[PDB]
Amino acid sequence: PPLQAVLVADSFDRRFFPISKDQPRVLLPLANVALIDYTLEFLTATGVQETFVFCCWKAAQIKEHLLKSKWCRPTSLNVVRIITSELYRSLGDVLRDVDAKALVRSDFLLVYGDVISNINITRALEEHRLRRKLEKNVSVMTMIFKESSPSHPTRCHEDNVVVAVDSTTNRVLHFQKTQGLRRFAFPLSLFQGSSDGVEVRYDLLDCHISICSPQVAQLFTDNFDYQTRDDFVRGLLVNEEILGNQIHMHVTAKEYGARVSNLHMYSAVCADVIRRWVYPLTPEANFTDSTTQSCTHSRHNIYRGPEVSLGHGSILEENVLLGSGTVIGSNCFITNSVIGPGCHIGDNVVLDQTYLWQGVRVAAGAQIHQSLLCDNAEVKERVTLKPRSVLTSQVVVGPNITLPEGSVISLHPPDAEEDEDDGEFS
Amino acid sequence: QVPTRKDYGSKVSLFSHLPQYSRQNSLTQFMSIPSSVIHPAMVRLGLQYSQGLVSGSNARCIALLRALQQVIQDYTTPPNEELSRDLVNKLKPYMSFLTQCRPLSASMHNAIKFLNKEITSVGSSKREEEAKSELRAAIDRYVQEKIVLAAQAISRFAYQKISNGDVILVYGCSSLVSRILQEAWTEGRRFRVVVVDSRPWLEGRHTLRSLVHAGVPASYLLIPAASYVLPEVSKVLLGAHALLANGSVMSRVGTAQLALVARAHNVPVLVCCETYKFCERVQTDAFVSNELDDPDDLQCKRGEHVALANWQNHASLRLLNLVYDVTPPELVDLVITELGMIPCSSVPVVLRV
Amino acid sequence: GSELSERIESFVETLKRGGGPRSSEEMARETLGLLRQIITDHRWSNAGELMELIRREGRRMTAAQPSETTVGNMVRRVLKIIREEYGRLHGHYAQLQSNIIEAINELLVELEGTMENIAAQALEHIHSNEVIMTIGFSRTVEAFLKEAARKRKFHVIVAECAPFCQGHEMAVNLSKAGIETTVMTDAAIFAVMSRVNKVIIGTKTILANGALRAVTGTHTLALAAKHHSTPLIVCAPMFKLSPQFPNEEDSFHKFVAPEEVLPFTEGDILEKVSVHCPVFDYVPPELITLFISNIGGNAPSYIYRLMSELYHPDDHVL
Amino acid sequence: MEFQAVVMAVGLPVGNKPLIWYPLNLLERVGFEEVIVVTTRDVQKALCAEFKMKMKPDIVCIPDDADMGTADSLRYIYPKLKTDVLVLSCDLITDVALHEVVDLFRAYDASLAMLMRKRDFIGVDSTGKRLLFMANEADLDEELVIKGSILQKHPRIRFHTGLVDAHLYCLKKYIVDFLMENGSITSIRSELIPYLVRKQFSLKSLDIYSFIKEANTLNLAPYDACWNACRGDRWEDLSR
């Protein structure tokens, strides 16, 4: 059967504000490449023949970005179907729209639009097809997880999940998040219903690569209060004597997979991409064959594009990415950073763990640590940004103006912490 | 009395004189639960040696000396007999059992030599508990001065060598080099450390954590990638397990490899070894005296196939994983001991007297 | 046309994503089949037009995987075939095309019997009760040794490669032939090099210096064999010979995900660490003794001549 | 002497041989030249004379009180034990080689090392040897709670439900010291197990270990497991 996939190109969470009020989070670049390109590259490398992109907010911009990409060419093996509606507002609405449109045929891939992965799911898909042939359409969803220690900067506190699985048949018995909970409660009917072994798992990073079935869309159209994925698995695991439909699981220990949900995942996943944890999806491979994104891989994971013109004394130590057309001044110090294409950096500036998007302009003497500079922004001289500082969409900070630690400034008054002007105040 | 541990696998024809055991079986399967022939601290130590829980050369020597403290404290004197002969004759089967669990590093041989010389020099007019306390104090002084104070001395002699802005290559896990790097980062030098690790122990991961938790910028890679990073390396520090009579450096198996690749890139090598690890044994190659670990440890799981899972069913297949090798002294530049910075070819001259 | 376009992009995405097909001679056969399908499914009047067509598609094909040079130099040999036949027919539409096709078929029938020709000359380099050392896994060296073992009895110390132990495959493939092989780690190379009589390795790409990129850990093996003055045999075919100089371009080593070196379950030390996994390594020609190809044994002081007998200097940058 | 074996009797020699003889036979097989045996007084306080009629090498059999527990039984012999204690029970016939559990006591320097053979839910680490949690709904009001620190330090915990305690313990000196200093413990299987399992979730700490055998099974105080002792001894006592 041909492998289908449903891509939700609109995360219905209110997290990238006010970053997302200009471009949706799926167009947000990790290293000069938007997230929808990473997701489509993962879907095309796994072997998906047809996807269904479901875009709700700022969907015309996604349409104009994705039609000129590699996955809408007629020479592409993975055909996409851009489906937009201004009516649906959650993931359950997407899958009930899928059931109403009757798009999928057999065992599609439900995935969000902002997942960075290189997982080859064909072994897990073989396992899922074996379980569907054995249990006679009893196994419904196969959630894909990755082995990871809880101390990893990838898994944050808002998305750490604890699962309870029967480890001999690899099925999920309990599922809950750890948001605001130091102790974890597990019911006891799990042990009395199945006495063939049981295991708890806290080492599972959620990849959100849930392989599904047309019965998933049936269950989403059957129950209206199922808004998202965790609602579906929580309502399916607490109800066994009605709507049995047990959920299985697959765990990968050799491939990377993670999705972005906030700035913390963004920084961790971008640092994993720059450090080549998602090979082959590496910024020099140019999985989206854009002529403005080719890079050269030097030592210490330094990726340099064409026409960069490093200044004299500029030191790039490790994990630096420079897009095509950026210019860097003299006596600089850039590390752990991503610089977009076409930027202008002044003299004696220190860029550590920063993410500069396209068109930025940094003046001389600036010290930027763990920040996020969006499109065409610029800093004046004698500025130093504290860690976790976000400025978006053509902001400018005043000279001799140091921002605090928690600092999100943009042109929108009520969504950010301040407003953008030539000076730091008003 | 004490049997011999069973030889595991098909031995190498070149290594027929060296024993090759396995970590799967233990020698204590057919021994008494109340430890009567060997002291209970000795059987506890031999079991935690054979299973690999104590692998460092200083940690093995420390656990040996502590078990010897437990033996000497739990010792009694037979009638009309002297301590200076019976205690030696009782500790010798203990060392035979410790050899049958795992072959001793030269730190353990020199520790046994020091304890035998000390127990020979116990006076005949002295009482039981006074000589027991004297021996316990001598063992305490030995460990304290030989390792802890020599380690501080080696750390001070290496702090004036590590400069700012350089890169340092380490291999394996050794408390001396890790302590050198930690006390150099704490005392003010700002440098970065690369770490070369090797299969199947992968013990470099330990020192990797020790450098990340200490705040040192670290880089981790394996032995075959060392040729890639030695162009970045300005100094290679190594942890020696024994220094021989000719000035050779016995260490983990990748030590001589790294020294050769570092000399091919004009990288100065620095060994750091305490003087109690000086051997009167001498060797010229890595073949006449070495330890052979489990050949069933080399197997790994790269996917769903383990090539060496049923390796014993192939009759013409031999597996060998050496633990120690030797370096020729023309590859090693520094030897940093508690006596000072000496060259490698001058080590037996200064160590002997 | 359209089928040819989808074949080109299926091959280019196969080389971009993973290893398809498995070994390198299969990929050379796929490249030659793709090029003969290219020259049979296009229209041209002058040879230079077809030259620029082959260059335009081969540029993308080498931009897919720059570490995989077999497609690049195979395309380059097809270009030299085009140039040779255009020169021999210039001093021409259908006869030229069929001559190119039969010369490419000649190249296929010489290319198919490469490993058997290397195996046929294996007996003049191996004597009985000899200690051979091998790194990695390679079908050329495996056919070499299992052909020389039909009449000789010797020993093979196959060394595993630390990122992913592929030489274990060779061990279980050698012990089926009764070689008395010996498996060890690559941390023992200089530990055992004092008893190894001859080192016989394969390679990934022969450069124009006589240098070679190969599986990582073989530059260390070459240094240890130069220290002990043991000769090196490079069982390499003649399609692993590329005109790319070593220090010319970037992207020499193929870096992979650091999962194979340090797993993801390590902890928060992954965020403060720099893990590299170069699966290739560069060996200068002065550390190499002898190349064994399908035409015989050659010195490293001869590869440039094979370059001028197999490639044209205007196609080096391709 | 390394170990001093103690066999508990808190409220029976029904079989092909004496029921006290099998534990003693196991003890006198591998070492244990001196054995401390506790006689019964709950059913009848005349069993010390039935305990001194066996043919072991050397036994010290003591009378006990009727209303007593296992912690009070070990606390009664506290000034007469000087080394590590290896506790057994009467209805416990095991064909398992015992030296495995002492190896887990010796190799890891554990604070408590115990042996089980397949109600009481236990959680053991993925290594299979160090246990981390144990509880039953006899004393649990809520369903199940797990500390967060033990999940951060041990990310996967394999749970078992059908595992029963064989009552073969290996306690150190300071644990029995805490047991004699803390007389609030009555059942050592529910007190010294659960309190030490909570105290193990502390660096410098204590180690608790477990060995899961798969050859035979232990018995019970009731007549539920009184049928398998003879069936075990008819096919296992030919070698003994």
Curated annotation (Swiss-Prot), chain A:
Cell wall biogenesis/degradation in keyword set: no
Effect annotated for changing R73H: In VWM5; with ovarian failure
Glycyl lysine isopeptide (Lys-Gly) (interchain with G-Cter in ubiquitin) crosslink location in chain: K21, K63, K101, K177
Resulting phenotype, R155C: In VWM5; with ovarian failure
Subunit structure: Component of the translation initiation factor 2B (eIF2B) complex which is a heterodecamer of two sets of five different subunits: alpha, beta, gamma, delta and epsilon. Subunits alpha, beta and delta comprise a regulatory subcomplex and subunits epsilon and gamma comprise a catalytic subcomplex. Within the complex, the hexameric regulatory complex resides at the center, with the two heterodimeric catalytic subcomplexes bound on opposite sides.
Disease: Leukoencephalopathy with vanishing white matter 5: An autosomal recessive brain disease characterized by neurological features including progressive cerebellar ataxia, spasticity, and cognitive deficits. Brain imaging shows abnormal white matter that vanishes over time and is replaced by cerebrospinal fluid. Disease severity ranges from fatal infantile forms to adult forms without neurological deterioration. The disease is progressive with, in most individuals, additional episodes of rapid deterioration following febrile infections or minor head trauma.
UniProt family annotation: Belongs to the eIF-2B gamma/epsilon subunits family.
Protein name as annotated: Translation initiation factor eIF2B subunit epsilon
Organismal lineage: Eukaryota, Metazoa, Chordata, Craniata, Vertebrata
Gene: EIF2B5
From Swiss-Prot, chain B:
Chain positions covered by the region annotation May bind the chemical integrated stress response (ISR) inhibitor ISRIB: 5-14
GO cellular component terms listed in the entry, alphabetical order: cytoplasm; cytosol; eukaryotic translation initiation factor 2B complex
Principal localisation: cytoplasm
Effect of C300R: In VWM4; with ovarian failure
Activity modulation notes: Activated by the chemical integrated stress response (ISR) inhibitor ISRIB which stimulates guanine nucleotide exchange factor activity for both phosphorylated and unphosphorylated eIF2.
Keywords: Acetylation, Cytoplasm, Disease variant, Initiation factor, Leukodystrophy, Phosphoprotein, Protein biosynthesis
Highest taxon, organism lineage: Eukaryota
Molecular function via GO: guanyl-nucleotide exchange factor activity; translation initiation factor activity; translation initiation factor binding
Location(s), subcellular: Cytoplasm, Cytosol
An individual GO BP term: response to glucose
Entry function: Acts as a component of the translation initiation factor 2B (eIF2B) complex, which catalyzes the exchange of GDP for GTP on eukaryotic initiation factor 2 (eIF2) gamma subunit. Its guanine nucleotide exchange factor activity is repressed when bound to eIF2 complex phosphorylated on the alpha subunit, thereby limiting the amount of methionyl-initiator methionine tRNA available to the ribosome and consequently global translation is repressed.
The family this protein is said to belong to: Belongs to the eIF-2B alpha/beta/delta subunits family.
This protein's name: Translation initiation factor eIF2B subunit delta
Gene source species: Homo sapiens
UniProtKB/Swiss-Prot annotation, chain C:
Cellular component per GO, a single term: eukaryotic translation initiation factor 2B complex
Biological process annotations from GO: central nervous system development; cytoplasmic translational initiation; myelination; oligodendrocyte development; ovarian follicle development; regulation of translational initiation; response to glucose; response to heat
Keyword field contains Cytoplasm: yes
Keyword tags: Cytoplasm, Disease variant, Initiation factor, Leukodystrophy, Protein biosynthesis
Regulation: Activated by the chemical integrated stress response (ISR) inhibitor ISRIB which stimulates guanine nucleotide exchange factor activity for both phosphorylated and unphosphorylated eIF2.
InterPro entries recorded: eIF2B_beta_subunit, IF-2B-related, IF_2B-like_C, NagB/RpiA_transferase-like
Compartments it resides in: Cytoplasm, Cytosol
Pfam family, one: IF-2B
Disease affiliated with this protein: Leukoencephalopathy with vanishing white matter 2: An autosomal recessive brain disease characterized by neurological features including progressive cerebellar ataxia, spasticity, and cognitive deficits. Brain imaging shows abnormal white matter that vanishes over time and is replaced by cerebrospinal fluid. Disease severity ranges from fatal infantile forms to adult forms without neurological deterioration. The disease is progressive with, in most individuals, additional episodes of rapid deterioration following febrile infections or minor head trauma.
Species name: Homo sapiens (Human)
Curated annotation (Swiss-Prot), chain D:
Disulfide links within the chain: none
UniProt KW Magnesium keyword: no
Cell location: Cytoplasm, Cytosol
GO molecular function list: guanyl-nucleotide exchange factor activity; translation initiation factor activity
Domain of life per record: Eukaryota
Modified positions (Phosphoserine) in chain numbering: S205
Gene Ontology biological process terms, A to Z: cytoplasmic translational initiation; oligodendrocyte development; response to glucose; response to heat; response to peptide hormone; T cell receptor signaling pathway; translational initiation
Residues modified as N-acetylmethionine: M1
UniProtKB keywords: Acetylation, Cytoplasm, Disease variant, Initiation factor, Leukodystrophy, Phosphoprotein, Protein biosynthesis
Activity regulation behaviour: Activated by the chemical integrated stress response (ISR) inhibitor ISRIB which stimulates guanine nucleotide exchange factor activity for both phosphorylated and unphosphorylated eIF2.
Cellular component, GO annotation: cytoplasm; cytosol; eukaryotic translation initiation factor 2B complex; guanyl-nucleotide exchange factor complex
Entry annotated with the keyword Zinc-finger: no
Function: Acts as a component of the translation initiation factor 2B (eIF2B) complex, which catalyzes the exchange of GDP for GTP on the eukaryotic initiation factor 2 (eIF2) complex gamma subunit. Its guanine nucleotide exchange factor activity is repressed when bound to eIF2 complex phosphorylated on the alpha subunit, thereby limiting the amount of methionyl-initiator methionine tRNA available to the ribosome and consequently global translation is repressed.
Family indicated by similarity: Belongs to the eIF-2B gamma/epsilon subunits family.
